Design a binder for these strands. Sequence first.
RNA 1: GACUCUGGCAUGCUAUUCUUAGAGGGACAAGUGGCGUUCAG
Lengths: 218, 325, 82, 216, 112
Amino acid sequence: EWMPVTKLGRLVKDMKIKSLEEIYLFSLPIKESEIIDFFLGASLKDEVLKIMPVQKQTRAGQRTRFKAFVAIGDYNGHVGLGVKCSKEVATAIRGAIILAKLSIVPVRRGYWGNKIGKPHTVPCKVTGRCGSVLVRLIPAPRGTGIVSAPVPKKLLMMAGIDDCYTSARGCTATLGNFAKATFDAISKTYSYLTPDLWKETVFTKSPYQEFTDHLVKT
Amino acid sequence: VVADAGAFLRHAALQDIGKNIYTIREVVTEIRDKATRRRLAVLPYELRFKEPLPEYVRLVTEFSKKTGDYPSLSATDIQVLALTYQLEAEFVGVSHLKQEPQKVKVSSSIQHPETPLHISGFHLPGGWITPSNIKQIQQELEVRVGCLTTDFAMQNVLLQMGLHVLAVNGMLIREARSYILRCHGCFKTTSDMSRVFCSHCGNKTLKKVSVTVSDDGTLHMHFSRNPKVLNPRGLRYSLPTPKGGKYAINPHLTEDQRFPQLRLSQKARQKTNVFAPDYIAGVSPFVENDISSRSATLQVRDSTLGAGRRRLNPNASRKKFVKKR
Amino acid sequence: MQNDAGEFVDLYVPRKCSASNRIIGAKDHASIQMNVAEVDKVTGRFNGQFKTYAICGAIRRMGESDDSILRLAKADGIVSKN
Amino acid sequence: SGALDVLQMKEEDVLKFLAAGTHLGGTNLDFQMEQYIYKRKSDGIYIINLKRTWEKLLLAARAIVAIENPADVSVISSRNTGQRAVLKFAAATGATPIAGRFTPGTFTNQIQAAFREPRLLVVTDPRADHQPLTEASYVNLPTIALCNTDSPLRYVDIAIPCNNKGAHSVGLMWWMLAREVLRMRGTISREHPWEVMPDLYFYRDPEEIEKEEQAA
Amino acid sequence: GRVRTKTVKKAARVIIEKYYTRLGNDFHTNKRVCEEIAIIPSKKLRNKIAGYVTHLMKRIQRGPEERERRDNYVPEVSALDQEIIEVDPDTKEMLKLLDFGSLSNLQVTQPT
RNA sequence: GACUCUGGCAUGCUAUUCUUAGAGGGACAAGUGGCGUUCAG
Ligand SMILES: [Zn+2]
């Protein structure tokens, strides 16, 4: 049973907001995971990248906790990356799943050469940086597949990228930095300005302003 | 003989001189000094409390808002003014006192406002402080009912209206000179010497200007024609981004802005007293410094401390190994 | 974006900042879509029509959003000259 | 003001500005506020150009009008000097006030008592009310602020140039903003002067309140 | 049976202690004025409010503000409507360039 | 079940008294009399 708190959640709970892309259009924060459960649902697969047990220094000594790196992703669409430290492994995993679901970004997919069929690769070579780890995505021809290390392999397959050349520099052995760098690159896919996106933007009314009368009643 | 709270603070035992010793309950019930309250329970009780009829309270208010003293006075000071006005009215004829007070005349000079004229120990070219002068040095010292008002705004409005005001000395006061603060943005004067932001505009722009009032009802005000006073040297400097939290010290730009509480420990803000009769049995000649508290680590200072540092302009060169907290 | 068949194969068109022509990203939370009322020229009351300006978060951070909105309002005849 | 003879600056408003002292800036100047300044006088105080004040005030009024639900506009003052005024602004217009300390996380922490989503934010002092400006950067809120000469313009979208230090000046600025937003909405005629005298908006200062209860 | 809830009690108590003057003993007038001032989401809830308020003012007519009064205070003449305003010379030049040179209340004060 | 939603009657608005399906109404213990800590019930 989901009882929304945010106005965006209350609109999503009704049939006021139709797609997730509208929430991406006005760059609004998603502060409830149940919205992402509503729009994507059974499409969302979740893949545990890593569980590392850690020792917290306590006044009693040291006691163990677990840190879960979880990549969630709708194929042919969206991903998010979450990290959670908690006492047991199950609660760390579901916390990382929620915290990965709150970070879902869209990925832009383009074409290598001729624009025949669905988009399959990254539109232009993008770059993501996290704590000396540098991860570059390069457009690849159809059928070449994801050529990359296993952790960005999972995150790029979950993004709906079918094929990509990759390059990584720095201490790639630290897994959180490497995952966060490839997550940064696939966010910069839509942050990049291409001649396709050169027509002047028309400004459609925001859901807070489109449905102000519906939010009066609550 | 209307006694202001300044007489009770100063322990001016002048009840034997006058017989019309009257005062408000509010001025005597607001005193926070323990020694004065102890002295109140010892004194012979000939003083009587009253409250003025509010009509003269208005009339006192409409000319205090014209003489330029209305923000300076308190409600209780208006009560004292109204009580002495009513006692003047009941005892003496009312045609003596005048209204619509006289316009100020302007006369400037060259002296800096910080020139230490009228400070007792100082001497330009004899002026000594003798054991015979300590009881004498109170202020500028010169029939039935008077006042014991020591605040300058009180004496200003009284000598503007024409009421004879007297001091801790029995003889009445003829001349009263002091200093006021005037804003050079909105030209509104304040009689409170402590206050640094203007009451009207709120800017840190008040500068010191001397005044003198006569017993006649004339106010004349002396400016300083010195270009050092109105010079904008260290007034424009770049300010840090505003910080919150428990430890932030923003540069204090408005009068009623909110600071986080950073108070000194009770051990640190204690000074050594040597006149105490239990001092010589004390282990050390001086109080121990506080080096154990959290405010010692946070380097909290007394507000009065480090004043000449602030008057150095911020666009200037300090020494290369010092840091200004 | 759009394939050789002609279909618009793209999830959405992101909106661009009115000051810098920069794409406002999906996680730009300091970005603004501001509405300024247009008024009658004979009475001076709200028409119901308004003008819309988008400002990305980098310009707002840099402190130039105020100047940018003022300059766009001069351009659109909302703010008078001088 | 679209160079319209209906919305131009009237004389009695200028007397309000000169008596309250809004033209008197501070002695410091921020470089992003140098456009709004007429000149520095030799005292050091910066004199604010009042036509610029009028234009930015009308931009703020136009932005506040364009919100269908007036409770979506939120008006904030942390220090006492503006607090009473912002309450009156609420009672004039219907905007939601926060007077007093702003609890951090009001706009970001969804599980909270005082959590709320505005659609516009109006601020008395960007230096004093810095915390809602930061919150607004987190949650996509535009901002209108009453900015002096020495004021940071991070996350401020419409910066009204005015003296925000004196009580009469902030009371007047809030009063004029309410007057213009309520004229431009249309519930007041522009030809008749407003029934609300601006002296309703100023700060009480409980010693002055006692000094007024004395003489009545 | 039927019982009233807590939020109805709190909202009714607030709207009574704030605005007892406008209310009457009619159900519908009280309901309309309650919808007029109180920002109430639901119709069923606001009729519950109106019923409980009617019960309260029925029972208090049987038998059994300082901050507001000081806060709503406004004087006879405002301080800004004053006969002489003293201005700097440079402010008068600024007003002259803003077409406002025909003012009568201005008194220019030279820096001396 | 003191949880959530909701029906009966509309000769009312909407493409409309007989069929429709969106919205707006109407019901809230509201009124009366008894029992009641005179208030909760
Ligand atoms: Zn001043």
